[PDB]
Amino acid sequence: VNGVTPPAVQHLTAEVTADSGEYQVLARWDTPKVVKGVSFLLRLTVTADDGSERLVSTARTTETTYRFTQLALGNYRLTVRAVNAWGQQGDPASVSFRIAAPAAPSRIELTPGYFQITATPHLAVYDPTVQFEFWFSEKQIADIRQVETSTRYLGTALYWIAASINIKPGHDYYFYIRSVNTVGKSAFVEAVGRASDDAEGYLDFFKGKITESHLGKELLEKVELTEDNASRLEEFSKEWKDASDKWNAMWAVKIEQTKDGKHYVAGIGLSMEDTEEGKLSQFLVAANRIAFIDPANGNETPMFVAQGNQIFMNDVFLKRLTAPTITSGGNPPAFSLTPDGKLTAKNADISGSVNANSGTLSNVTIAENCTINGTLRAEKIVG
Amino acid sequence: VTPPAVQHLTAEVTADSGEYQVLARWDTPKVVKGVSFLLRLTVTADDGSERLVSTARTTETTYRFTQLALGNYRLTVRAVNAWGQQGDPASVSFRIAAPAAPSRIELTPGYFQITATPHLAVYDPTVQFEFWFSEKQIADIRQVETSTRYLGTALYWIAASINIKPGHDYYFYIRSVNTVGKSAFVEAVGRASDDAEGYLDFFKGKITESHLGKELLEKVELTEDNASRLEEFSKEWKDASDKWNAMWAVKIEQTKDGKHYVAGIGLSMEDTEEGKLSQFLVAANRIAFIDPANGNETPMFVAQGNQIFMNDVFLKRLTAPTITSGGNPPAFSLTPDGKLTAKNADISGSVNANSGTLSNVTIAENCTINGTLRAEKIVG
Amino acid sequence: VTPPAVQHLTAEVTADSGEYQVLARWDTPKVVKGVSFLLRLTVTADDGSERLVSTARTTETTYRFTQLALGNYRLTVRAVNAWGQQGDPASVSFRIAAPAAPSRIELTPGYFQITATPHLAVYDPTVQFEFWFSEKQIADIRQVETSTRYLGTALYWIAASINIKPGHDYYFYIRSVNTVGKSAFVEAVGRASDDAEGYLDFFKGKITESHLGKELLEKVELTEDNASRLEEFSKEWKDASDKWNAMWAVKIEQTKDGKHYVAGIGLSMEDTEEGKLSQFLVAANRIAFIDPANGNETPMFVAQGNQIFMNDVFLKRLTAPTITSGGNPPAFSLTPDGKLTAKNADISGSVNANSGTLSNVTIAENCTINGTLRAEKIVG
């Protein structure tokens, strides 16, 4: 025999890829004669900023190919050996590569809307060749790797405006944004967002949708009865193809009058019109006052009512409310809460604590420990 | 194993097929791959003793008893498995004999309405009531059924309709009605609450005194026990005062067990001093709003018996003489009379108050006093 | 040589036949040349011992003792050979008097039903239960069985009435029954389930299990791509229960890239096991109530899926397990745990508190520390 030491490899190549994200590297080369194998021992180290090394992996194969899987982006150096059956290590070779990626978006801002949400993201420094890729989600995803799968891919711009019928107010939505450009893709920056919440801020929105439809441009905005004094109490069902060449439907009762040189109308209409992506139903009732009742044993008082923007309910169990304003009624409100935060009360019992930044009383009475860690001042004392 | 208990037993009294019949229905907690049920119906003797009448062993969830005469009865069910392990029993006492005379009567006024409710000298849950309304006193009971208003037949009857106005003393003549028959009539002397307003009592009042009100109520046509009627129409007419009256309604009525049943939907504008005033009035026992996107089926808005359910909602200002969170102990709650109730409250500012009732205090800095201090055990 | 004790000694008491009795049953152990059962029944006297009552010798594995009185008893059985050498004894112990009425009663309030499940301290396997429901707590107890709807007699009840509607209390009168007697009565209180989203899937229960659902939803009428059908139909017709079912509806369906979109509302009045029920189903992707008053074009009530949006509103009570002012930092809130949030609390009255933590407090009158003052610094 001869324990001949294995002369080092040449034509050592590293190929960098990003198959499932989390970049890998495929190490490959060629060799002349081998004895009871002649192993290949590999080890791969990243140069830190200052020129010192992290150990990243090792590898004990026999063929002239290998792959390194969970990777971070860093300046990597891969060294390959050649040990023989006895275990006498040949001279090394080494190759160096990088994985340069765009800088993350440093802060992304998230102004609400009406059934919509804007992310406008910004980088720590200005970058001319950066454009961000946005993926939207409704549930905080576990880790910042499976976003490539479990989060819808919105699109890619300098910003995005997610509108739909499904971004619903007071349910937070997490935006996942990664910077992209010619050089690669960064990590995923996460952020939360909302919809505006503001109640009366939704009603104008709805008015706007309503108006731009079959029932808006039929039940109202219809210009018949051109003679003072009439009652064209009308009721039909029309379905037809549109300029988009899709079917649309409405069936209504339109009633309307002319008296004293002025017009009126009231209008129970039901439809389903097309949209770019699907069909939106709708059941729009315009009238000077709406109310319902349970007629049980002679009872005729409506269960609810509403008439030019004031709606009259007996008792409700709400899943959750959310008004900026509350009153006992009257003009000493027995209690109140206002858009500023003030909880106007009368007699305010609390089974728990009151972490208040301050007090402002007359007549106090503590039945156990009264601690003072500040500058206590007093006039007359008898205890 | 024993099959579980008997759930939802009932003690009812039918006379549909020409004579009296006692049905019951029983549903199973969890169903045990071959549940059987013994059920025992027995009578009370003149000495108040127990006599067996009918024992049925069946594997079905309902049964009927036919050719059953007058008297008081007791009905039990047990569950028996294949191996023969009779379970816990569930037993209800019922009666085939009735019409007692109502002992007291309860009267609650209201805006254009007045509640008459029965009180029977002994309770009996196999009974409903006929109500008759009179504007003039009827001395003899014979024309009480003939020369008055047929209010109807039900449980708790409130007087509220077009013929009812504040300030007149109305009368009630009511009796007990069942499968057996009806009793000696009883009277009461009662008055509507004129106008107390609530905040919808004005809207009821507005509603009653309208053409929709007259159409979709107090039209009591089609009165054939266990029959019914539908109409979808639009009757436009010119009124007394030389003006139009438009209207469109969908009205359904039925009659069953002597009692009158109805609902529907109206859209109308009448004539007021200014001119026309449009509408949509629904009356019914449950209304209910649905959104079928994705084939989701859960309402967002369900109202029955003057109450609402609603999922999430938003608002420009609540106006509300009381709130809770719900709970036998409600997590928080403002009272109409100004009291607040909470397990906690963390204010990021200043607590302007009159007084204090604090078992513990922990003031972190300066405490200015301009009055008198009284501290038992003092350190410093 | 010695025969063994009688095993599995089982006693059941009854007085149904006219007055009080005990059935004693057991299983014979293996003996020599025949066997006789000796039974000795004693009652616990005033002294804590047992006064001897009756003694019999028999030869059948079951026996009866008649015309005994009320008390806790020791019944001893022995196995005797032909020679008179009696085996080991087996003495059972079992109790008699008016059974003890539950110590408690627990209500898991279900969505539109109570589940009132009693319990005692010292458990007797051989007492049943009577249950009673009422809407009004009664002054006395002696007229409950004269003034209360009879739920009946089981181990636990679930109580239902169709009109049940959450979030009011209703009062309970339970008792233990057995062969001895109906116990003294017992009180309790309860309500129903409070949550709304629960009701709304509940009501979805009620919605879908109707011919309303079965026509509106559940039927997949139409097929080929770009299908659209609009129809107005009515029927009041015979069903299997010999009832008329009465329904007018509006319905639309459409097919776009295959997927099938329905919407449609309808008044109806179908039949229930108690009476005909008159119920609204509006369904659409979105319903708005909007007003025509003076070129009015803005809503006051927009229900888009699981949400509602509204304007200024007017309630009478509220039960809402969260209310927040909007904004990521809300002006105020109450999450369900009863924690309040705010920035001013001008309770112009007593803060009836359990803790305060007020960094820099002003007092301008009497401070009366019943506990421990504790001050780093004082300049008084």
Numbering used by the authors:
A (entry chain Z): 613 to 995
B (entry chain F), C (entry chain J): 616 to 995
Reported in the publication:
Following extensive cryo-EM image processing, both the tail tube and the density of the FNIIIs of gpJ were successfully obtained. These enabled the visualization of the tail tip opening and the deformation of the central tail fiber. Upon LamB binding, the bottom part of gpJ exhibits bending. From bottom side to top side, its cross-section progressively expands from narrow to wide (left). Upon interaction with LamB, the RBD, CSF, and AHS undergo a range of structural rearrangements, from subtle to substantial (right, 3b). The AHS situated above the CSF experiences a dramatic orientation shift of approximately 180° (right) and enfolds back onto the CSF. The upper α-helix (residues 809–840) within the AHS remodels into a shorter α-helix segment, flanked by an extended two-layered β-sheet at the summit of the CSF. The C-terminus of helixes (841–861) in the AHS domains have transformed into two additional β-sheets at the top of the CSF (colored in deep blue). The loosen of AHS helix bundle leads to a reduction in the restraints on the FNIII trimer from the bottom side. The linker between the HDs and FNIIIs disengages and repositions, leading to the alignment of two FNIIIs (gpJ-a and gpJ-b) on one side of the CSF, while the third FNIII (gpJ-c) relocates to the opposite side (right top). Compare to the closed state structure, the distance from the FNIIIs to the remote end of the RBD markedly shrinks from 29.7 nm to 13.2 nm.
